[PDB]
Amino acid sequence: ELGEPIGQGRWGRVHRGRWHGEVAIRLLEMDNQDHLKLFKKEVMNYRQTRHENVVLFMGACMNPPHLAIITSFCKGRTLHSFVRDPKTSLDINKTRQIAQEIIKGMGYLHAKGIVHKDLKSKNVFYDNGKVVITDFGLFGISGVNQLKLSHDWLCYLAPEIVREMTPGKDEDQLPFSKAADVYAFGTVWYELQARDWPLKNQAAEASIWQIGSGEGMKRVLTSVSLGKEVSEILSACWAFDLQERPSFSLLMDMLEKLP
Amino acid sequence: VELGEPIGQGRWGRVHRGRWHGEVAIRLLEMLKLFKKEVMNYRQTRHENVVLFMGACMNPPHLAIITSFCKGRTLHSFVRDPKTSLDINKTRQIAQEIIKGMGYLHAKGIVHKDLKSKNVFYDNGKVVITDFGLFQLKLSHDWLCYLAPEIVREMTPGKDEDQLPFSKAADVYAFGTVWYELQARDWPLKNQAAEASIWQIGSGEGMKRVLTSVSLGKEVSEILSACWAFDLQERPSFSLLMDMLEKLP
Amino acid sequence: EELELDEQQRKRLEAFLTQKQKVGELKDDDFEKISELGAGNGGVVFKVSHKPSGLVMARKLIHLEIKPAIRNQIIRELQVLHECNSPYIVGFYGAFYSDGEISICMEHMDGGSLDQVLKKAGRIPEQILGKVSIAVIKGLTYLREKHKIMHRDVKPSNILVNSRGEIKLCDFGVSGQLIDSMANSFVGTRSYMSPERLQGTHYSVQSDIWSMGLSLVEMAVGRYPIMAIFELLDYIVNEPPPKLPSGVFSLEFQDFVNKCLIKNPAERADLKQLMVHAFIKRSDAEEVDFAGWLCSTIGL
Amino acid sequence: ELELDEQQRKRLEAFLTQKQKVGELKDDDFEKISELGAGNGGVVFKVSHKPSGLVMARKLIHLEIKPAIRNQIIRELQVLHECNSPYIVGFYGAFYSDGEISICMEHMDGGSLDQVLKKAGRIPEQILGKVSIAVIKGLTYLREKHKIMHRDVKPSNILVNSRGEIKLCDFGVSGQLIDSMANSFVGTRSYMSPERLQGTHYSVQSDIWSMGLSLVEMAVGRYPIGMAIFELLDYIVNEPPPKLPSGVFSLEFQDFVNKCLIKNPAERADLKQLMVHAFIKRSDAEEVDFAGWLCSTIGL
């Protein structure tokens, strides 16, 4: 679509116009008005993000009660399905390269003051080497006697979050944080090594205590025998004290000095 | 915002394929395989100091290049506005924004070939670089002031620009003139015959007289002397320019 | 041995089998909805009329977003319930899938769950809990001896009673695929899970004993005897087990529950030891009109 | 010196009384006859005024500039109304139309010496002497009576006609027009003085160099230097100046051009010294039918 010319130059003419491109649209149903205000403040910041490991945030069409989030469509597979395909060949180099792409995009988001809140192998898209992070800043929204927790999601949740979990509490009151984002990356780093979840599928109650008490991740780091340097990165990201978990800028160096 | 087929379902609603109508800028050009190789690399660029490269369509006889439409004023018009309050801090902050964007392109192996104040957009602090990778004799005075001596020494009527020695070191030279416009709010060479400018630039005597006669700070001038270096091998990199700008008064 | 068939029980089981012999394959159109009996943790249960026969059934609906391949593995694994025939196990009619949900059509227990009875009766007296403890034990041995499967979800809401005086178990881990599909999803406000299960340690029928003990203490005092759910789970793991008030209940009952609520599953009493316990030896010789008490308490 | 011949004064007086009949010039008042050429952002047409019967030469300069400075260009070009000389092309008027600035001037049917050289191959010495007089006389007229230099002396800006006249055009009469277009165009030959190339201070002495280099090109029929334009310019700045071949042209001519092509403008000959030079004393006394030679050479 070509529009009105805006100035003349030596290299042809430059017009205004409109472009139609393939995108991904997430629809959400909204159940106070201060919700939409906070969402607006976030999507303005998200619209300014620029990083080749972060999905391009196109914008949001707020048409009450339907909320639409528009991002660029991601070619490729999720890292979740990529690592669980037996026909995929991983190694100490491939996993480090994939990790550092994730670290670079996360480090950028935290530099822009954006906590992801749901970093997981399902929200990372792999496409012949290219690594892109999706679905950042989507747990603080407010929309449509028992909690419903998936096994996949629990493996990424830090102890401080599952300790405040209780039926009836809104999820936007859970302590999501940069440190919690690092902890989730710890699980992503585990999947890159073991091609599977860190905790056995079991009752959600048992998962909550094993994560909230720190004993689960300890048994994993003990029973599962990976490389000593690989295990160190894992224990740093999974540190019980959130204040002992490294930053992503520090994780980049830790990853870089692997075998 | 036209909908499409649902891809999958999760805790956070449903996700569908779709298309979106977005505000973009289009540049039309009449006239090849290098374009195909370049535009694939240009579309993957992501940096908040570099304009978004949407893509390019080639319907003969026109070659359309599609980028994000930039709000704000060109750095050319910005520095040339009497109200614009520039200072050793604001000029350094603006310059460092361009350096970060130029450094990224060079890291991706992309020579800009046309860095200038008219290809930089300023918007309430936000700085974005445009028009990268685009490159009888009609030579504008504005363009000559950004051209490195090795480029003007090889300018010959009839020769395509594809033979001109564009390079990262030339890009640094063009940045030097941008830095000068940030200091003096004007071109470095007086308006004169293009022939006189060609010799003054190609011989290196032009910027030498500029640095001499002008009363710019020793630190500010050192940036200029480094960028405008006659020997292109002596010009710094943008990653090095970052630290040089950071350590200014 | 302790699964010996009483004559009235054998005829009731025989009757239920010949009643079940005439229903056939269950479809959604067969069922007319009477009332909703309750819900919780991804499942809702209706009282239902199966129109081909006249049978009033209980229909449990489990909403599950899963592939049809493993959905049929659930329906296939539930067929084992056809071989779970005991006076202490709830009868199974059939299981099918419709409109995103899995249906499990079972025997309707008109007395509901002891969780409901407790809500109306306030507390359950010791003599009545003796009859309940026998049935839970016998039912658990039946699943272990005859089907090699443990319950995994013993609690007052899954112990069903009826005006005939019967005490039967339901909602036990009969389908491995159904377990893994819905177990890690839901978490409630109360917990009856053993400490070893919470700690993720190897768990056996000994964990079901813990749940039975904790259930008896709740049903005796009429209050959950143990706030973010993690604190609750952490209490079960690191803090001492609950116990009955002192002056109220008999010593044999206190000893019975305390041997059920031993944190170490190896030192916790097993089913053969509980079968010959003083509280059971006494409660089993006792004559109790459970059918009468149940009706007069809840209004049947 | 610099005073008017009787035939010249009447021809100038005739042109002025003819110029007193044009009035305000509009685009509609002109019918295009032919295109005479183009160069440096300007195309020139032979046209015909409609109010008068006058054949004019109309130069069109494309300039993307604000109308404020566009009117300053038109205002500064009005000075041409006071540039009345037999060695300066006459001026009829100037206006703006559809983004282009029009300069309507006297038509010289002989064209430029650049065009004559292309058809003549070379121009003999006795005729270049008649050219040299007019250039000097035209330059000193602009300096004496208007205090402005030419800034663009070269064969393309020396016009001739079948009457035998030799006049200068395209000189820097408008400061705003100089500043608007000079920085835009660069050709393949350069007639600019070394001091202008170096950006140092310059004067009418720079026009002397341009005349001298023009004489050398028109004598040998080839641009005497030589490629990249910078190499051409750097040769002008740092290499020795050109000179005429010895055996052909007279010594007085060789000394005339050598005294014009001295790199140091202070040591370069000025207008007054060139006016009394041996080559000028000789060429001015000579009788040469330039009107006849021009027509027979180009074909008129």
Ligand SMILES: CNS(=O)(=O)Nc1nccc(Cc2c(C)c3ccc(Oc4ncccc4F)cc3oc2=O)c1F
């Ligand atoms: C908290 N403990 S846990 O975390 O282990 N989760 C689980 N525990 C135990 C079991 C399961 C799954 C399951 C369920 C819930 C289930 C429900 C009804 C059912 O119908 C009848 N039931 C008994 C008698 C007659 C019937 F018709 C069969 C069922 O079979 C099942 O397997 C769990 F997910």
Ligand SMILES: CNS(=O)(=O)Nc1nccc(Cc2c(C)c3ccc(Oc4ncccc4F)cc3oc2=O)c1F
């Ligand atoms: C290369 N040297 S430079 O860089 O100085 N460039 C320049 N040189 C010289 C002049 C200028 C500007 C200009 C131009 C181009 C011009 C052209 C025609 C004109 O009409 C007549 N002219 C003379 C006699 C009669 C006329 F009708 C008036 C003009 O008036 C002007 O002033 C330059 F830009």
Ligand SMILES: Nc1ncnc2c1ncn2[C@@H]1O[C@H](COP(=O)(O)OP(=O)(O)NP(=O)(O)O)[C@@H](O)[C@H]1O
């Ligand atoms: N992506 C863009 N967004 C907004 N304005 C733009 C964009 N690209 C170009 N322009 C403007 O469009 C006009 C023409 O662009 P352009 O052809 O690049 O001329 P220029 O670069 O400004 N000067 P020149 O060197 O002669 O081309 C200028 O006013 C630019 O500032």
Ligand SMILES: Nc1ncnc2c1ncn2[C@@H]1O[C@H](COP(=O)(O)OP(=O)(O)NP(=O)(O)O)[C@@H](O)[C@H]1O
């Ligand atoms: N930008 C995207 N491009 C392409 N596919 C996408 C994109 N975002 C999400 N998807 C896919 O669309 C489906 C639904 O998205 P989503 O609701 O985010 O599910 P999920 O993240 O994989 N699991 P959950 O965490 O429970 O939402 C999944 O298969 C995603 O992999």
Ligand SMILES: Nc1ncnc2c1ncn2[C@@H]1O[C@H](COP(=O)(O)OP(=O)(O)NP(=O)(O)O)[C@@H](O)[C@H]1O
């Ligand atoms: N066959 C049945 N006859 C009568 N009532 C029944 C029957 N099956 C289930 N119920 C009742 O249905 C209600 C809901 O049961 P259910 O959906 O299994 O959740 P719950 O056991 O109460 N708690 P939870 O296990 O955490 O979901 C309970 O109050 C039971 O008493």
Ligand SMILES: Nc1ncnc2c1ncn2[C@@H]1O[C@H](COP(=O)(O)OP(=O)(O)NP(=O)(O)O)[C@@H](O)[C@H]1O
């Ligand atoms: N008054 C005139 N009468 C006849 N021919 C003219 C007249 N004025 C200009 N011309 C011719 O018009 C053509 C173009 O002239 P012009 O636009 O001044 O460029 P140029 O001087 O020839 N080349 P450049 O060095 O780029 O300026 C040349 O062939 C001139 O001889």
Ligand SMILES: [Cl-]
């Ligand atoms: Cl940099």
Ligand SMILES: [Cl-]
């Ligand atoms: Cl439970």
Ligand SMILES: [Mg+2]
């Ligand atoms: Mg997602």
Ligand SMILES: [Mg+2]
């Ligand atoms: Mg541009």
Ligand SMILES: [Mg+2]
């Ligand atoms: Mg139940």
Ligand SMILES: [Mg+2]
């Ligand atoms: Mg001319």
